[PDB]
Symmetry: D2
Subunit: 464 residues, 4 copies
């Protein structure tokens, strides 16, 4: 069964009765609540349906809160929605107004003072393109160059233009607080630009008295220039290909994706690949050949997890998308679970032991390898190795089971806190014997202790 | 500049004035004439516009004739086109009729006698799905399971069901003949199943007194079981992902693609990857993140050439598709031109010398590798190696320049037939000096003779 | 300090007062008692002086009993000693006589019935050579071809001629018994030919009620044809180059030596290299350049131990030989301790863990590897790896300390039978702390249990 | 047949009738004339017997002139020869005298002013050892520590003490001149210390109007510190182990030997290994096991050539020594001709092509590699690769055939100068066809031109 994890985004299409349960049963490992849409009641209902489904099926399911970030968007139109056609002049002003088809506002108040002539403006991730003709006082005058649809509050991106905006907006902080009190397991931050951005998130968490892992979404050039620093300061990364393919040339995105996955893996941080993987399944029951290829290739790149966005949140086939994503992942993994070799050589006790434990397990045909861990850190160092052996984490903290839900190839077990190696072994055999694929005699390799011990153990027997 | 080749499909969208010229100027290396659509006049006009554009720009452009093969299609509907909806019963009969919405004919006359209850029927490569309920006399009764649109003569696929049909239909043979007299450079055959299929194509060519390279399109399970035999009997392969993803589970297609490219490269046969690479650009000016990824990944897989089908043949952005495909290819190649290592070890004189010539060229920082060749065979053995050095073929046969247009990384030069090594060197220096990248002093490596010589030569200097 | 072990042979030159002690202090790791010379009183005195010296210095010293085997030798001469000169005819008869210079007896009673015309006869390992002219009744008539000295009972070898003789003679069995009662640690058997030879030694040991490790000396062609079988049935091997270079062409001996060392190492059996390593030091205070090279090369080949024979047993510089041998070994090891890579890949629990333990130790810069073992088996699997880390064996059996004295790189510690992992760790820290260069904080890797545990431990600290 | 070359030293034992011829027929590839012994008439007679034997057998035989260098030696004794015994005081004075047993002169006039108390004095390469007690005025007072024999003019070495002496003495220059006029092919210089030493030899050669290759003998610490510089400035190196093992600790010599051979091979310079390889064959018809091992190990180290000194020059078995040396070399090579991998990567045209030519030859099972060369430079770059293919040099200069006689694996052919590639090929086929084991159809690889061409050619056939 499947090693690569699947992240699904909740929204309108999953609000109907017991669709969230259906997703979990179909293989969803992490549920993303997108704070760009919906109200707090919406998020709250969805959060609870996930907890119920996780508890009712016994599948681990993380809840991931995605903060909107400093997203730049259009203001409001008189008609609600207009149409921008190849040829037209359009004004985007920092001054407030109830925008009309030719004139409209933005949330970015430094637009006029930061846009220059020749700047490109991409709307809704490249559905409509404009070029800046002039900055007159408080207005940015533009000519539509590729036409299409514009609603209220749709997102625009100005490639190249250096944006000045705080990493967390007022909305974000409110939304972060709400999510932390609600009890989410992880937080993603959009439009991350430097390593210092995590410290702002950390300040808010410390104020409220609760921390969780923070995921940096990579969708900005500055993020890619500081990729290593970012992967080190944050707990995980999401390759956010939607905005990444408008903030950067779309032709560069495929190599950036591979570079980020490798960088994450070398540092034992989870990496998620997002956006448009099975885009066409928003309308169609089967994906395109490129979409199947894209998912297969993200698995071979070595991604911990792949994400569905519109495919589950607003589309007509949320369940089939998840099922289809899962089949592709499985088809690839059945053939081989091999990932790109890592170039870094373990110098840390935990790392060194993890390599060794894999070697032993693989050479001895072990049925599984088992790690005890507090924060998951030892398990993540084993996960990046991409062994075909079942990787089984044992922990006392139950929130850690939810956090490891987005780590490659890993199932987690909650157990009471232990005070002897004898304890650990009895514990393991007990926990594992309750599954049908584990019988007395099965050979496993156990890593334990702050980790400093490898133990080759046959289930049931007294080898300790 | 670009090493990977681009194949474009001509049709309605490229018939407008000087669009074919525009494609060639945008980088089209091979033009595919799809005999599933259009009349002989259409093909003839398009063929001539390609010859003109190739001659007027000086870019090599192959013309590839795609034979329809034993495609199974629906017959004709009374109303021309109906709608098949999730729930309905539908009959597909081998008897002739002017089919109505509930009842319709097929071209496959063994349908009733070969279809069985529970058989799936996929229409138009998975836009509509049906399941066989009963075979009553001459009719195949079906229940629509995923609904959508059905026109006249649309293609259906029955996964699993063993088809009995000759590799070349009467239509194919006529179309092959017409194309050979018209003067195409290559021929692709659809729905290839065994190595013996090429012998049928060869019989027709011999009758007419003209041969060209034959490309096996891989879109059938039997083709994949005989992959090695097929790659050896045919001159090239196209991974035809459209039908391949309905004849086989779509989740398996990505690994089949990689396996075929590797198999082609090990045998120095060109491989093309086809269908849905930038599918969304039929309607949109920019592709999806999955589509960009799919193209990038086919280049890294090691494909000689990538193909556009509907993106150029019927869509709204044929030029942009080609330009976009080219940018992605270039973005990938700029980073690296490295392909998957080959596992076979050269035992053939020409092969062994090709490896050696690459080694020399790379270690000496040579500006280019130059091969003389009759059929292109030595050049193809060098092309599969994927060196970053310009690969330059020299030949007397002008049709060979068109055939090498779909071989990785390769530019070809026509020269008069030569009868001394002194001649070859003067020839090379002359041909190469007429370009801007080549100046006196530039170091190149020349392979020559049936090939048995390597010559390290500085342009201009007397070192023969 | 030194990793490669040194075996010394005791005899007349080491019988003077406290020379045995001097050898032990100079680095002798194993003392060989050669039963081809001396009486039981001699062996007994020497054995006791070794036990005393081992106990008084605290250096481990094994005692190795070398059984003469089916050595073929001349009988007795009237004059005691004669001279065989290039040109002369000589008879070697199976009948008893008090041989003169023209006529003399042999111990081999099948000589006449097994020698044929043209057979070569080498005396004293190639000091004198003869050729067989005729077999007349009970005599083998020979022509001296290379002249030199012949005393009574000197050893002859007939290259090629198939010898029929029991692996253990009556003398051997008596000598084996005497040695087993005396309390030697190992036994070497000369002229081994098949794997079944060890079973004969085992029968004698079982009768007497005491087993020790048996070393096969390799000095026969049949031994080299069955090298793998022999290395598996015996506990160790000695490349006995003296007789090996007359039983085989001397030019083949160097590759046979390397092949045997590799074969031993692949199976974690100790290998000793013997005879003429510093031959000239029998007369001279310094060796030849070839001799220094030969010792250096045996270390690089990967030999557990090198042996001195005449250099210590009869020569004028027994102490200097040992000191000189030690300096060369150390000079080589200081540069590097790297041996030829092993080709076999660990499939056994013990083996797999040993590799892993080395990896951990090396990558973590551990001060030492520590193995607990019953028979030494786990330690030998680590020793063949040739790590630069100190390798420290812990055992309850004191005879095992003597047996491991001929295993590469290994020091042994006697300890009471600990009965808990807590025990083992306290035990290790205690034992190791009693030396300088082991201090609190030093990092070591411990292998333990039938072995199934690796434990990375800092000396002193509580991390069990 | 044999790839490794053999150097023999001529002297008293080879002066008897037709022994030089016998050596050449036994496989001598280079004859060393040692100018430390004999008069000019002696050298002259020996030189001519070598030319005759080389011409009469058709075997290439180089003549190598070994210059004594700044050898420090004792003066003359009243009794001619005395005996220095463990215990005695001995004076070695820079003042002239007809030394007696207690008092004697040296050639080194800076002895008293450069020797200090505690200095070791080794005589005749370690046969007698002394320690300096005092420097009184013009005398160096010594205590014998290891006793033995002292003749007139025997060589002493003072390890550590920095010697000041010109690289060429007056005797050397005379001897160099005489040898150059006599027509030797190579020159070796003893006690080389820096790269600048070759420039002094070059000055003398230029004065006299004739150059030959110069071999640096390595027998000094300063030589080993400047090993790379020396290997680059000189044309070849000899590991002169006799003095090297007294100027340096003898235990270090074996690794210095391997380091020098590797350094030579990386720079395509021939390396010779000298002194005491079969030392015992001065008195005995068969060597020791260490001696056989030493020769085998020098071949595996990758030495171009091994040298005999006293074994042929003064001993009782000059012919057998050469035969025995040859058998060992062949025994090793039959198994494999593989040498230690080289770490440098070819960046020079000639080097790069040599690698390539080997690759082609080996992969195509070519019967031979053929190189054309002026100075031998291309051939030496191929020789260091140690391919199992016959390596055949073609040159117009006949002295080059003599110089290549000490280069691994290489036979040379003299041919008239050619002025077309057609010429070269006809030339090769002609030259090679005159041997059995070259027949029409045999495949060879030819390197040619200043080298810039590889040509895979079947003997006889027209494929130019
Ligand atoms: O936010 C995202 O996931 C994106 O932009 O692709
Ligand atoms: O024919 C094709 O290109 C296909 O089916 O994908
Ligand atoms: O017995 C031995 O050791 C030998 O023959 O070398
Ligand atoms: O000069 C030599 O040959 C030596 O010293 O070994
Ligand atoms: Mg985004
Ligand atoms: Mg098709
Ligand atoms: Mg023996
Ligand atoms: Mg010397």
């Amino acid at each position: 069964t499947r090693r690569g994890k699947i992240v699904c985004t909740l929204g309108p299409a999953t609000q109907r009765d017991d669709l969230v349960r259906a997703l979990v049963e179909a293989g969803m490992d992490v549920a993303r609540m997108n704070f760009s849409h919906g109200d707090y009641d919406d998020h709250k209902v969805a959060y609870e349906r996930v907890r119920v489904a996780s508890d009712a099926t016994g599948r681990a399911v993380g809840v991931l809160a995605d903060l909107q970030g400093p997203k730049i968007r259009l203001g409001r139109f008189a008609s609600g929605a207009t149409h921008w056609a190849e040829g037209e002049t359009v004004r985007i002003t920092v001054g407030a107004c109830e925008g009309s088809h030719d004139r409209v506002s933005t949330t970015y108040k430094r637009l006029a003072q930061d846009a220059v002539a020749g700047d490109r403006v991409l709307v809704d991730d490249g559905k409509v393109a404009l070029v800046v003709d002039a900055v007159e006082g408080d207005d940015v005058v533009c000519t539509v160059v590729e036409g299409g649809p514009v609603s209220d509050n749709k997102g625009i991106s100005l490639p190249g233009m250096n944006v000045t905006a705080p990493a967390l907006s007022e909305k974000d902080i409110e939304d972060l607080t709400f999510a932390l009190n609600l009890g989410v397991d992880m937080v993603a931050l959009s439009f991350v630009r430097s390593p210092a951005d995590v410290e702002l998130v950390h300040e808010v968490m410390d104020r409220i008295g609760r921390r969780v892992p923070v995921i940096a979404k990579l969708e900005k050039p500055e993020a890619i220039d500081n990729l290593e620093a970012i992967v080190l300061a944050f707990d995980a990364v999401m390759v956010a290909r939607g905005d990444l393919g408008v903030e950067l040339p779309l032709e560069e995105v495929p190599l950036v994706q591979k570079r980020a996955i490798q960088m994450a893996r070398e540092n034992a941080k989870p990496v998620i690949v997002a956006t448009q993987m099975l885009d066409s399944m928003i309308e169609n029951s089967r994906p395109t050949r490129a979409e199947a290829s894209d998912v297969a290739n993200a698995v071979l790149d070595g991604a911990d997890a792949l994400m569905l966005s519109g495919e589950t949140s607003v589309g007509k086939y949320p369940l089939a998308a998840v099922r289809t994503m899962s089949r592709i992942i499985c088809a690839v993994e059945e053939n081989s679970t091999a990932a790109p070799p890592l170039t870094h050589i373990p110098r840390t006790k935990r790392g060194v032991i993890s390599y060794a434990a894999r070697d032993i397990g693989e050479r001895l045909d072990a049925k599984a390898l088992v790690a005890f861990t507090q924060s998951g850190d030892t398990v993540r160092r084993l996960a990046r190795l991409h062994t075909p052996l079942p990787l089984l984490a044992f922990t006392a903290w139950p929130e850690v089971r939810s956090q490891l839900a987005m780590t490659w190839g890993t199932e987690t077990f909650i157990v009471p806190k232990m005070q002897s190696t004898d304890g650990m072994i009895r514990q393991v055999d007990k926990s594992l014997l309750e599954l049908a694929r584990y019988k007395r005699g099965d050979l496993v390799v156990i890593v334990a202790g702050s980790t400093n011990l490898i133990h080759v153990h046959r289930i049931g027997e007294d080898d300790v």
